[PDB]
Design a binder for this molecule. Structure first.
Ligand SMILES: NC1=N[C@@]2(c3cc(NC(=O)c4ccc(Br)cn4)ccc3F)OCC[C@H]2CS1
Length: 374
């Protein structure tokens, strides 16, 4: 019921995302559902795709209502297609409630499900504006807040076989150390934020800060990498290269086109910290989040032809995406009631004896509004 009963309600595997158990229909059908703050549709497998463990069978549900409307969602790395309806939805290890939510019954997809994963649909937690087919399709969390007395916020602790917590309706103070710092949500569509400054190992990148948000910056648990606009990526790598001079590496590595390996002997110490300064709550005030190489150098456990690592910072043409690389350092509070997102040092982030992930402030930063793109 309460927040204790929600601790540790997330599961997954490295590179396959975090999922929460949900029930849909009556009687309740159990599905595992990818937690995605980067989209706004609740969409589940509804047909026996050979790689799904379980799927939504509408014919078995007494409370199912056909909306007599289809939906077609292409995106860069894939597509799904489905039939809109509504049904009763519960979260067993969430608040003690049942709600009537929109469901897209997925009937055809390409490169949407992961071969080998233990989830079979997606929970988009972002805002109606980016819901398919349009913002009249009320996102799940909107329905949850409207139909109940669950407070309008949730928080995510992503750890990594991975685990974590999704606290629906509140904050659990044991999941973080130090204090929460809040950045405003710039516009309620994605969880858009504004980055005001970037440092590699204390050294500023000294770019026009608008480049950091071209054409936007988002917090997205449905993306693995920290993704950076192309110009920003170029400068960051050039600067990460300079700082990690001790060893040299091929161009293909930085591009995520090869891995690089060490004996059972990783010198994380040879790699720099990365700091993002975010717009703060108050005029001219910012704060910074700092991640370790333990967040951006990801063990590739599946290398059959060989301890290898993927460089998990990549180029974007869609703006900055603070994906799992960022969120695994932090307890992240999606404070929808106050249009703000909070960051605190996660009690489960992977670090060593030399260095920690950090959230520090306040700092004084001028023209922070100028960093947003229009
Ligand atoms: N936010 C995102 N949403 C998606 C989307 C995301 C995912 N995510 C993952 O598989 C995933 C997450 C975390 C880790 Br760690 C590893 N993998 C799977 C299918 C999707 F369709 O939906 C609409 C846009 C699309 C791309 S961007």
């Amino acid at each position: 019921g309460s927040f204790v009963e929600m601790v540790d309600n997330l599961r997954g595997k490295s590179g396959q995302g975090y999922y929460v158990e949900m029930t849909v229909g009556s009687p309740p059908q159990t599905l595992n559902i990818l937690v995605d703050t980067g989209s706004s549709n609740f969409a589940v497998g509804a047909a026996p795709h050979p790689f799904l463990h379980r799927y939504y069978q509408r014919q078995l549900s007494s409370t199912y209502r056909d909306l007599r409307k289809g939906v077609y969602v292409p995106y860069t790395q894939g597509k799904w297609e489905g039939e809109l309806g509504t049904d009763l939805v519960s979260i067993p290890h969430g608040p003690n409630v049942t709600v009537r939510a929109n469901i897209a019954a997925i009937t055809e997809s390409d490169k949407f499900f992961i071969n080998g994963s233990n989830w079979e649909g997606i929970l988009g937690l972002a805002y109606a504006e980016i819901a398919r087919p349009d913002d009249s399709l009320e996102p799940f969390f909107d329905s949850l807040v409207k139909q109940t007395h669950v407070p309008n916020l949730f928080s995510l602790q992503l750890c990594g076989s991975v685990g974590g917590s999704m606290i629906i309706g509140g904050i659990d103070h044991s999941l973080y150390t130090g204090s929460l710092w809040y950045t405003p949500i710039r516009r309620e569509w994605y969880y858009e934020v504004i980055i005001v400054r970037v440092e590699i190992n204390g050294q500023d990148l000294k770019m026009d800060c608008k480049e950091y948000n071209y054409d936007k910056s988002i917090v997205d648990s449905g993306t693995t990498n920290l993704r950076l606009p192309k110009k920003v990526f170029e400068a960051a790598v050039k600067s990460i290269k300079a700082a990690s001079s001790t060893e040299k590496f091929p161009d293909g590595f930085w591009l995520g086109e090869q891995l690089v390996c060490w004996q059972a002997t990783t010198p994380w110490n040879i790699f720099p910290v990365i700091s993002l300064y975010l717009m703060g709550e108050v005029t001219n005030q910012s704060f910074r989040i700092t991640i370790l190489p333990q967040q951006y150098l990801r063990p590739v456990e599946d290398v059959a032809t060989s301890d290898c690592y993927k460089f998990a910072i990549s180029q974007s043409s869609t703006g900055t995406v603070m994906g799992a690389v960022i969120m695994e350092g932090f307890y992240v509070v999606f404070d929808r009631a106050r249009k703000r997102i909070g960051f605190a040092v996660s009690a489960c982030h992977v670090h060593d004896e030399f260095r920690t992930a950090a959230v520090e402030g306040p700092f004084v930063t001028l023209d922070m509004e100028d960093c947003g793109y229009n």
